[PDB]
Amino acid sequence: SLSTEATAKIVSEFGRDANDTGSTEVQVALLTAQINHLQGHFAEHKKDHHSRRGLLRMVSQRRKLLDYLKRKDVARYTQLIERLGLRR
Amino acid sequence: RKQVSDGVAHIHASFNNTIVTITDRQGNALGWATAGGSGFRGSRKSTPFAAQVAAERCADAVKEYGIKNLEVMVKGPGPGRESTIRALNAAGFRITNITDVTPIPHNGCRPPKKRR
Amino acid sequence: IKVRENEPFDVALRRFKRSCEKAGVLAEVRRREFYEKPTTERKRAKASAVKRHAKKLARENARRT
Amino acid sequence: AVVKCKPTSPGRRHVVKVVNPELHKGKPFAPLLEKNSKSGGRNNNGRITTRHIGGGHKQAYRIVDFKRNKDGIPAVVERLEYDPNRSANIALVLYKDGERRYILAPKGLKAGDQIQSGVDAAIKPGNTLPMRNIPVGSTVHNVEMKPGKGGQLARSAGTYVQIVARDGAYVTLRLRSGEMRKVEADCRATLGEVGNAEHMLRVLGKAGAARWRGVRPTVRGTAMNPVDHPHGGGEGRNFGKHPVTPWGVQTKGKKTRSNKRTDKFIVRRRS
Amino acid sequence: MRHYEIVFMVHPDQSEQVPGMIERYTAAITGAEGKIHRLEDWGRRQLAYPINKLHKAHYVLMNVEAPQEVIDELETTFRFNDAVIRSMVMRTKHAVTEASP
Amino acid sequence: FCRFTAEGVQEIDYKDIATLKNYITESGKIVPSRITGTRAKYQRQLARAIKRARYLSLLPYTDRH
RNA sequence: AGGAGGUAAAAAUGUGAAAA
RNA sequence: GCUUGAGUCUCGUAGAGGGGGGUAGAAUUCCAGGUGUAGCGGUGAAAUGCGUAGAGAUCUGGAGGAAUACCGGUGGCGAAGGCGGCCCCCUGGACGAAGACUGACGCUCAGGUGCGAAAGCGUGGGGAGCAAACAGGAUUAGAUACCCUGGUAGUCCACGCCGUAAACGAUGUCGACUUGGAGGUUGUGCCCUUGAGGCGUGGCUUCCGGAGCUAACGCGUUAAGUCGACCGCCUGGGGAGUA
């Protein structure tokens, strides 16, 4: 889900304004939260098959976006992976 | 006998037989009705005529019982279904109520598969 | 389900069932689902209903009458 | 739980353990523990009356409170103790006036679930009360037969008794044999099933394990000599005699119910 | 919070002991910040099907916008007491009043 | 074939007793949209109010009690 | 005429080679 | 670097989307009384089965497990398999009017990976009904056959496992492009909300059919029409999808 507030929270925490949500770095960070937003749901119920299908779909959007910013910028990539703690 | 006014005749109408013992809402059961015990075997078991002659032989000597009008509770299709109790009304013995309780479930337990 | 009328009935007089089912839901939904085929038998008679619909539109040609 | 060990040696291969970590790994409560010598199946005459008995590890008798006449005072479950004499684990309870008792452990019992016995306690697993005060259709264990006897039926691990009908002063019970028996409504019963229900899955594995449980080897009938048992003798395996006990009584088919005074209380036969 | 429609109903014998407990559940409704909209004591009308006993039971309606924590509380509260005939909770829809029926 | 939400806005709820019983029948059947001409999205809401009031005992699960 | 109800016993074989 | 590609947020739309937990009534129905006459039963007809202790039948009382009649529809959602009473819980994805935002991050994909009807299988429960294996009566030139009365495993929930199908709209996925009629259809723009609407908008879907195309059948704006990206697959039939 990643409710409206927490989405509107991190954009104002990783970006210039709340309109920076369709900007790349926050586009990444909302999905990183999206994994953690669903980590509890897979800690339970063990059979939500279609629910995990959305998560695997997401991690590609994380990774495919992880290389576009990496492509245009080596340092913003190194910053984003340590501004949040991803890419291992 | 017991000499009462009316009664509650529950008819279990199977695909073969309109089984009805002259019963009551309290369990007082006296006068049987059978589509095989009234003769009529062979093709005549699921025939409406088997039930009608059995239903007149169901209300046999019930005038002495005091009972004239009887609450028919017919359950199922029944071989006669529209003449078994009707000839009893045509003979004169009217019905207080015909409650055709079709036991319709919400499709619970699995039903059989005869006539493969 | 109930056909009584209570004062003026004196006979069965049950066309309520003859106009609704009379044996309909008892002799069909008693058993045997199969869960696979009927929809085609539904649709083929619905195609017959479509054919009943199609034949009603092609009535007016000349017909010699 | 139910664990199977790796085949590191034959005799270790088919073993399945019944490990239960909740059990009190300590020493049992001293004053509730009396001695108990073994017998080897020998009566006052010293003769072996029941065979296949002897040896085994030395065990002590834990005083299991069966009667539960302590009523009105609540009891806190202290700890779940393993028991050698029973088949089910027992529980050490703590009566609120300061008493220690050992009771059978019901199914869903934890270390600290407060229980109560008598007519006052509501329907809860581990509570005990006369059967006229129990809703018919329930499931009990530790059932008395005479009022004040102590409780004889449904004592084994993983058993239970369903109360099926209550006729006045008598109660019909679904006994774990596919059988129904009448009993006085004033008799007490403990609610719920008896815990340690996985005991049935225990596999002894090797021959020595049954030996240290006190069971001494049996001997087949045909392997004996025709003066010690009605079978046997001959060229070996040449049978032809109907299966009989060593004392001439036929086995495999003969009903031996010979009581005559309690058939009034038995409603339905064993299945 | 959720804009739920709590309702229930009650058999006549219980109908005169639930009013003491009506204050108890209205201690729960208002005690969890839940904004009450209806409190409808409709009256003992005849039931559609015989519910645990004969027909003709009293009905009491709530329709309260309350948080989910108390909706968990109330359903669990009737688990130990099947006296008050079961409470059904309906979805949001965001409204307040339709007076009597 | 009636006044619907485009013109006749109406809450399809199980609280309103009138409209709830207007699409039922004595034979234990919600009247289908094939004759009454209701709209489908509201028919699903029309479907829901029956199951809702069946729990409220405004309508039973059978008809004989 | 749109919907509906209503509908019927077991019955087998005839191996080769013949297309202006 | 912008932007019609693509992507994100906002705000409303609907739904058997997934799973977990309660619930309720009916229904074949077992534990029995009441009261009660001889059959019940089944079909092509007969019969083994079955009941005189009193069955079928009878109503009140008690126990469940497993599925949800009408609604329900070439209807919805999901990749597909497939999923259907109700109710709240954590949670999937799509669509829509109109804005702001980064500015080509995409399209497909060997390998690998996951899901994957039923049946079968593994441990444990669970068992009401249905019913393989299994019993019988007959119809029969044969009955391991229809028809017929019993019944186990299975169905069952939880965890595993198998990884097969006519797993099929027998049509791969992605995007552009090319006359229409007539149904179903949900967000949605304007006008008189004057009134059952008029006038559209688009998602998706059903059927008949145009050019074209097709061996023909037919498909036919959801193409099998007109092109492009790329993966997979076939080379006569049997042998064999076997060794």
From Swiss-Prot, chain B:
GO CC terms, sorted: ribonucleoprotein complex; ribosome
UniProt GO molecular function: rRNA binding; structural constituent of ribosome
UniProt cross-references to PROSITE patterns, sorted A to Z: RIBOSOMAL_S11
Classification via InterPro entries: Ribosomal_uS11, Ribosomal_uS11_bac-type, Ribosomal_uS11_CS, Ribosomal_uS11_sf
Domain of life, source organism: Bacteria
SUPFAM superfamilies the UniProt entry points to: Translational machinery components
One example of a Gene Ontology biological process annotation: translation
Keywords: Ribonucleoprotein, Ribosomal protein, RNA-binding, rRNA-binding
Subunit details: Part of the 30S ribosomal subunit. Interacts with proteins S7 and S18. Binds to IF-3.
Function: Located on the platform of the 30S subunit, it bridges several disparate RNA helices of the 16S rRNA. Forms part of the Shine-Dalgarno cleft in the 70S ribosome.
Similarity comment: Belongs to the universal ribosomal protein uS11 family.
Protein name: Small ribosomal subunit protein uS11
Curated annotation (Swiss-Prot), chain D:
Biased composition (Low complexity): 38-47
SUPFAM superfamilies linked: Nucleic acid-binding proteins (SSF50249), Translation proteins SH3-like domain (SSF50104)
Biological processes annotated in GO: cytoplasmic translation; negative regulation of DNA-templated DNA replication initiation; ribosomal large subunit assembly
Sorted UniProt keywords: Acetylation, Ribonucleoprotein, Ribosomal protein, RNA-binding, rRNA-binding
InterPro entries, per the entry: NA-bd_OB-fold, Rib_uL2_dom2, Ribosomal_uL2, Ribosomal_uL2_bac/org-type, Ribosomal_uL2_C, Ribosomal_uL2_CS, Ribosomal_uL2_dom3, Ribosomal_uL2_RNA-bd_dom
Keyword NADP: no
Gene3D superfamilies in UniProt: 2.30.30.30, Nucleic acid-binding proteins (2.40.50.140), Ribosomal protein L2, domain 3 (4.10.950.10)
Source organism, top-level taxon: Bacteria
Chain positions with N6-acetyllysine modification: K241
Molecular function in Gene Ontology: RNA binding; rRNA binding; structural constituent of ribosome; transferase activity; zinc ion binding
Keyword Cell membrane part of the UniProt annotation: no
Residue span of region Disordered: 27-52, 220-271
GO CC terms, sorted: cytoplasm; cytosol; cytosolic large ribosomal subunit; DnaA-L2 complex
Subunit description: Part of the 50S ribosomal subunit. Forms a bridge to the 30S subunit in the 70S ribosome, contacting the 16S rRNA. Interacts weakly with S6 in one of the 3.5 A resolved structures. In pull-down experiments interacts with CedA.
Misc remark: This protein can be partially replaced in vivo by its H.marismortui (HmaL2) or human (L8, from the 60S cytoplasmic ribosome) homolog.
Family as reported in the entry's similarity comment: Belongs to the universal ribosomal protein uL2 family.
Function of the protein: One of the primary rRNA binding proteins. Located near the base of the L1 stalk, it is probably also mobile. Required for association of the 30S and 50S subunits to form the 70S ribosome, for tRNA binding and peptide bond formation. It has been suggested to have peptidyltransferase activity; this is highly controversial.
Name recorded for this polypeptide: Large ribosomal subunit protein uL2
The species this protein was found in: Escherichia coli (strain K12)
